[PDB]
Symmetry: D2
Subunit: 223 residues, 4 copies
């Protein structure tokens, strides 16, 4: 199967809406109560570093309380050395959107050497119709208002960055990454079933057959 590490925001009544950390499985390793705010723009902050070896997420809304979750995990023992990073989304049977307004990533590998740092950094504040640097999978598309629509507008969409990412290296004193993305989940229904995730996977990851709904387009089965 693909190898997945993902921080997901989900309202699927499996059972309150929550933010969760997933290490190779949809049955989250850790979750926190999340107050999904329909129609309001949210902001997810994800961070990791090899020294602490702890993956942390923070989701907040303006004038708001924030939800936060952290999980101690050494990504070196989970993920391959080279990965692709991306955004996922799955809609239950409700009318709703999963608009990503902006996305940014930064990765750094600092060696044992003097002045040896390797780094990648992309910042999307405005997606275009032909966003060549992104691999779009599922129902995802770009250009709609200069945004990225992950889900159809039971839909599943995804968008991974083109260039593979060097997440870890056996000779680095401190590897690290940090991702930030602003989303807008709008639904006419009062209690919609929806989910987005920032995930890290093998370079050639693709939508598993039947990864719909609570499987977020990341996993082929919970069982």
């Amino acid at each position: 199967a693909d190898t997945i590490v993902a921080v997901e925001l989900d309202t699927y009544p499996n059972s309150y809406p929550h933010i969760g950390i997933d290490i190779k499985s949809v049955r989250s390793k850790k979750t926190a109560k999340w107050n999904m705010q329909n129609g309001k723009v949210g902001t997810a902050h994800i961070i990791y570093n090899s020294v602490d070896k702890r993956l942390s997420a923070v989701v907040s809304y303006p004038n708001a309380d924030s939800a936060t979750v952290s999980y101690d995990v050494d990504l070196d023992n989970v993920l391959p050395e080279w990965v692709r990073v991306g955004l996922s989304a799955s809609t239950g049977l409700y009318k709703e959107t999963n608009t990503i307004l902006s996305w940014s990533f930064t990765s750094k590998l600092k060696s044992n050497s003097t002045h040896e740092t390797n780094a990648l950094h992309f910042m999307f504040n405005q997606f275009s119709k032909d966003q060549k640097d992104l691999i779009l999978q599922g129902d995802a598309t770009t250009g709609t208002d200069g945004n990225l629509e992950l889900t159809r507008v039971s839909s599943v969409g995804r968008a991974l960055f083109y260039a593979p990412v060097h997440i870890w290296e056996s000779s680095a004193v401190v590897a690290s990454f940090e991702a930030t993305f602003t989303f807008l989940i709008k639904s006419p229904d009062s209690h919609p079933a929806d989910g987005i995730a920032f995930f890290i996977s093998n370079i050639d990851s693709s939508i598993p057959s039947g990864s719909t709904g609570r499987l977020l387009g990341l996993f082929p089965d919970a069982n």
Copy 2:
């Protein structure tokens, strides 16, 4: 054929730094004092406001050479390009080692907080450098470096960054880029024929047939 814009350093039959817009017949050149066995540093910069491409090549103890050319890249290059390093050796024993490479591109829209940006920094190449497309005799890992031409007689190598780059956009108020790379040209011969270039091209550019020597692996012929 391909579309090429490149800043080249060449000693072929006099050593000079030069700007090439779609042709090997440089649009502008400057006298260059090629220092055998010494690490050099090329700084290339451009911005849509000034609309002027500029390069600076210096060696420690410092002989710096610099060349600028007024050109609106919007009318030359496609919207999406791949960036890279090229090198061709004449009939001499020599190396074209790249010790570090870094790039930074930015698109600032008319909107407020409009910025789109990409940035990579290689200070240590690895044997499996998945984020680089190697063409020709180029390879990586040798000392954690990038060897453009084969290390030991008419050799051509190239290395382009994986992710396409959004170099211009009709709705940007200022687009800009900046590249920096440190090279080491070592040759036992007193007056070796050699050349490196930082070039920008269409995403699917490849080594033209017969682009050896003076043609730097960029051009298929001297027109």
Copy 3:
């Protein structure tokens, strides 16, 4: 007198509203027609680099045309080696504000050495009541909506960054800087007399006596 280099936006009918470059004097070295948009947030982009030796400014408004001005000048021969950078504003006799919504600066000195770069970078997207890292002069204050009010709310205000800035160095192959700031000029009058400027001066620069109005708080006299 103080040493001033500034990019100013002014509507004082000395005579249309314009954007201008000032090198040690209020009688601009170069100016461009500017369409001052009352009540709308604007964005000034200022850039310079020692290779091109050309100072450029771009002012745009959303859904807009942009005004732009560039001036060839070697700052090394104008400014001291160490300077403080800041924002200025002067109101004529009209009711109006000169709110700065965000400010950011970046300076870099790249030496002849391999991996020798020196750099400073600040980004203000939200000013607080006690903004200790800014020196406020005149009527300027902070905290009002998490913004900086340059002018009283015939007022003159200014705000310079605390840390002195190393703009140039005789041993740098390329010195450079870039500043961006978003302003909101609101006035009930149809044709108000106002002016803001991003200026660079000696570390101990202060408001000259009688620098009001068309002198932007930068110069003590035009004559």
Copy 4:
């Protein structure tokens, strides 16, 4: 007295790396293999989500030592602080040369596009380094370096960055900082007594009377 948080490397009467929260009696320490005459690299990091301070010291060929401490800096440090480097030599001949220093602070608000940040990078100090406050025996320019203790018997030197730093804000969703510095401790004695520290303090901190040796110039006494 002053308020100090510091990550110190000390060999006094055993060499270890340690975290100090308001007292020389380190809260946590790790065995350190001080390599005389070899350039070392300290990486210090913190973030308000994890609320854990972490350090990593490594030498090329690589013995890395690392220490972390769970602490909420919001309850220890004032809101505005100055950051710096300290050093104290015992009765031995030795130097505490800092080859490069860099810092990065960020305050991300609850708002959208909320970020506030400061960042400096010194890779080459000059004789008149106006943006640094030197205290004690510290000086700059010697080889384009920073000599914390006097170069040739009980010497204490310190260098703090000029601009105050906004390290925390009650309305931030994630505050964070990161510091990196390369040092060179050269001593003719086989087992020299010495110590350097990266510390954070109140803006007006100065060398306490009698802060020599084990007290690193940070503390006036061992309590």
